[PDB]
Design a protein around this ligand. Structure first.
Ligand code: SF4
Ligand code: CL
Ligand code: ZN
Length: 178
């Protein structure tokens, strides 16, 4: 059994190709503003209601976002294996392992492994650290593969799933605008 963190609906659509019997965990205080949080949570909720997935929605609140912030407020650098995005992702998966340890699941994972390739090493390193600290096994698979990716793209266009074009945080939204 496994608890899977959900980053976004596109990546959930890819992940269910490979693993459909998970409890899913949408927890993303890294997202600003709230209107973008809600639009993405409603994407996922659309996917879950259509495929009858078990999704649990974590906390989003002026507190939670603030724990996130100061947790990454020291760093000014973006990208895989940047310190900031390592503390970020580590914040999210820490909460997912916490929830999985509380609920008794044996393993945790994340739809972040449905993301481009080049991100897998950083996410695997974080997962293993977290595993060590909380005693929930980190499950690693490249979810893009075996056609899952273009399946999940197929359904994204058929179902009108919102596909975001920035990471989530205000830093990356400045980044996209450049
Ligand atoms: S802002 Fe960029 S690096 Fe910061 S958490 Fe979101 S995606 Fe990761
Ligand atoms: Cl992503
Ligand atoms: Zn995502």
């Amino acid at each position: 059994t496994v608890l899977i963190h959900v980053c976004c609906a596109p990546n959930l659509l890819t992940t269910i190709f490979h693993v459909r019997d998970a409890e899913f965990f949408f927890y993303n205080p890294n997202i600003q503003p709230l209107s973008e949080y809600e639009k993405r949570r409603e994407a996922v909720d659309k996917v879950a209601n259509h495929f009858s997935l078990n999704v649990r929605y974590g906390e989003y609140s002026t507190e939670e976002i603030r724990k996130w912030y100061t947790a990454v407020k020291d760093y000014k650098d973006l990208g895989e294996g940047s310190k900031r995005c390592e503390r970020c992702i580590s914040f999210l998966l820490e909460r997912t392992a916490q929830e999985a340890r509380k609920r008794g699941h044996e393993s945790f994972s994340t739809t972040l492994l449905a993301s481009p390739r080049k991100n897998l090493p950083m996410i695997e390193n974080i997962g293993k650290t977290i595993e060590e600290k909380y005693g929930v096994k980190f499950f690693f698979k490249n979810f893009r593969k075996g056609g899952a990716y273009q399946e999940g793209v197929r359904l994204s266009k058929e179902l009108g799933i919102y596909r975001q074009n920035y990471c989530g945080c205000v830093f990356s939204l400045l980044e996209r605008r450049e």
